[PDB]
């Protein structure tokens, strides 16, 4: 058998890479963590360094508060018994306030207040982390793509628990923090709105989700098939096209009639995925606020 380049045959290690500097505040960067021989066979072996910063910490803190706040509640339902906790870990749940309380923060802790507490922490955690992925790129002088593509995910997240519950009149329409319970919520959201398979955005969402999985398979497999010509070095293959990007382009032209460029394929990649939560966000926002049943709508449009 020939070599497939899935796992490296020989690892090589040198001095820990402190990374580029540019306008980064080197006082916030931690110290290079260890080297993993494990991860080495697959990707880079170097863990760290990581950049902390004020925003990094605010987020990381909110993040644990959100995680602990839920857990305090799970232990509560487990009667502080370690065996129960482990046994029903999947069934516990932090439900939102009841319908009565509407959009107020008045609800008692034991019936949705604790949910509001948590969500607050999660609301801070997320956005702050967004800010972070924007500032880190600015420090390095790179484009804001990662920050923008992250917004797309924030979009759906925002609709599901904030935007939609506000437009409905109650925090009771948001998602509960629980493994099995948030699955149950999903199933209900479909039934109540007349089967989401009739929602055209949901239909499109699935298109891209499947598409993203098609595309990476394609892109991945491709770059590995011409790695033997230095394909993974995309950026320099952008500025100076090599035999790698040509054969790559030609395999797909000959196959399905058309192809991409070493820079273009990424523009496809970035959108294909971004649209998943883009269309999905819309689809969920128009559910219950404008369209009560997607089957009925599906009959008249």
């Amino acid at each position: 058998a020939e070599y497939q380049n899935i796992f490296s045959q020989v690892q090589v290690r040198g001095p820990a890479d402190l990374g580029m500097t540019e306008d980064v505040n080197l006082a916030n960067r931690s110290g290079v963590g260890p080297f993993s021989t494990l991860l080495g066979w697959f990707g880079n072996a170097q863990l760290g360094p990581i950049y902390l910063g004020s925003l990094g910490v605010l987020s990381l803190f909110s993040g644990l508060m959100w995680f602990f706040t839920i857990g305090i509640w799970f232990w509560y339902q487990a009667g502080w018994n370690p065996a129960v906790f482990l046994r029903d870990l999947f069934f516990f749940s932090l439900e939102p306030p009841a319908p009565e309380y509407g959009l107020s923060f008045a609800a008692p802790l034991k019936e949705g207040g604790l949910w509001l507490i948590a969500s607050f922490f999660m609301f801070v955690a997320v956005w702050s982390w967004w800010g972070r992925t924007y500032l880190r790129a600015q420090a390095l002088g790179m484009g804001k793509h990662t920050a923008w593509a992250f917004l797309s995910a924030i979009w759906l997240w925002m609709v599901l628990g904030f935007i939609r519950p506000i437009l409905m009149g109650s925090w009771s329409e948001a998602v509960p923090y629980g493994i099995f319970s948030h699955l149950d919520w999903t199933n209900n959201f479909s039934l109540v709105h007349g089967n989401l398979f009739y929602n055209p955005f949901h239909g499109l969402s699935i298109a891209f989700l499947y598409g993203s999985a098609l595309l990476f398979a394609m892109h991945g497999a491709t770059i590995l098939a011409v790695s033997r010509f230095g394909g993974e070095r995309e950026l320099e293959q952008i500025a100076d096209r090599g035999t790698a990007a040509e054969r790559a382009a030609l395999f797909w032209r000959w196959t399905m009639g058309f192809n991409a460029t070493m820079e273009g394929i990424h523009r496809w990649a970035i959108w294909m995925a971004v649209l998943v939560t883009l269309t999905g966000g819309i689809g969920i926002l128009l559910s219950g606020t404008v369209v009560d049943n997607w089957y009925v709508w599906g009959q008249n449009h």
Binding site: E22, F92, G143, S152, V226, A248
Partner: protein, 280 residues
């Protein structure tokens, strides 16, 4: 008809069957024995779908729908109008998919690249064959397979899912959904990365793979590497499909009850099975 850098690549050879007989192109499309093979299987199949359109009495795409034999026919053949067409079309679809794959192989041999593409395609080929071939044959009737209709096949999904309650509970389905969601997050990133590098703020210079690796170490404390993210992408994908095919081969064969009840094996563990409190 050619790309500015194409000619030098259009050389003879590489075919698996038929030497130089079909070794030629038509516009951008490369042909090859298998180029032909799928045209045959594709057209014949289309014809049959069109013929099953007249037997149903409609030409609307959103209504056409080729259904399989009824559970009464077992794994035998059936009359064209009552599942016999679906069975031949299925033979034709598989003939096209397979051929297409093999066609990509001959295109690789000519370009001297690796067989990663047609290898990754074989994974979708597998998913499909699980639904229309392996699951039915193990259950005992072509009827458990899905119909070829734009919406009718969505129903099949919806009906097949709710047969076992909330399908969400199938454990392999949960594993497969993870890989899908991940694989998208991943593709979203890898594409934004390579672009935020080649397209830096206005005026500045193209960044280097060094700034990429940097950028992520600062963000999450780790960078898989340009050869790694492409291995990962290829892996999150094929896996999400592997687990998907798996989550269905076990549904209706080794397990046919509500999926949500399968989770009792965990809660009914001697150690805590009786301890009071909690949810159970």
């Amino acid at each position: 008809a050619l790309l500015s850098f194409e000619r030098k690549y259009r050389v003879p050879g590489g075919t698996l069957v038929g030497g130089n007989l079909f070794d030629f192109w038509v516009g951008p499309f490369y042909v090859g024995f298998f180029g032909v093979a799928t045209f045959f299987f594709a057209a014949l199949g289309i014809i049959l779908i069109a013929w099953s359109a007249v037997l149903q009495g409609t030409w609307n795409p959103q209504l056409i729908s080729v259904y399989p034999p009824a559970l009464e026919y077992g794994l035998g053949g059936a009359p064209l109008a009552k599942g016999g067409l679906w069975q031949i079309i299925t033979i034709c679809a598989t003939g096209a998919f397979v051929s297409w794959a093999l066609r990509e192989v001959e295109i690789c041999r000519k370009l001297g690249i690796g067989y990663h593409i047609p290898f990754a395609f074989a994974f979708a080929i597998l998913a499909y064959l699980t639904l229309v071939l392996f699951r039915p044959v193990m259950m005992g009737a072509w009827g458990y397979a899905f119909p070829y209709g734009i919406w009718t096949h969505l129903d099949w999904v919806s009906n097949t899912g709710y047969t076992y309650g909330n399908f969400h509970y199938n454990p392999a389905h949960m594993i497969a959904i993870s890989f899908f969601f991940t694989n998208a997050l991943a593709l979203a990133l890898h594409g934004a990365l390579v672009l935020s590098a080649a397209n830096p703020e206005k005026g500045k210079l193209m960044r280097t793979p060094d700034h990429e690796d940097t950028f992520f170490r600062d963000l999450v404390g780790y960078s898989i590497g340009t050869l790694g993210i492409h291995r990962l992408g290829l892996l999150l994908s094929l896996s999400a499909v592997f687990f998907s095919a798996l989550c269905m081969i076990i549904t209706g064969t080794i397990w046919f009850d509500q999926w949500v009840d399968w989770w009792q094996w965990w809660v009914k563990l001697p150690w805590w099975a009786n301890i009071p409190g909690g949810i159970n």
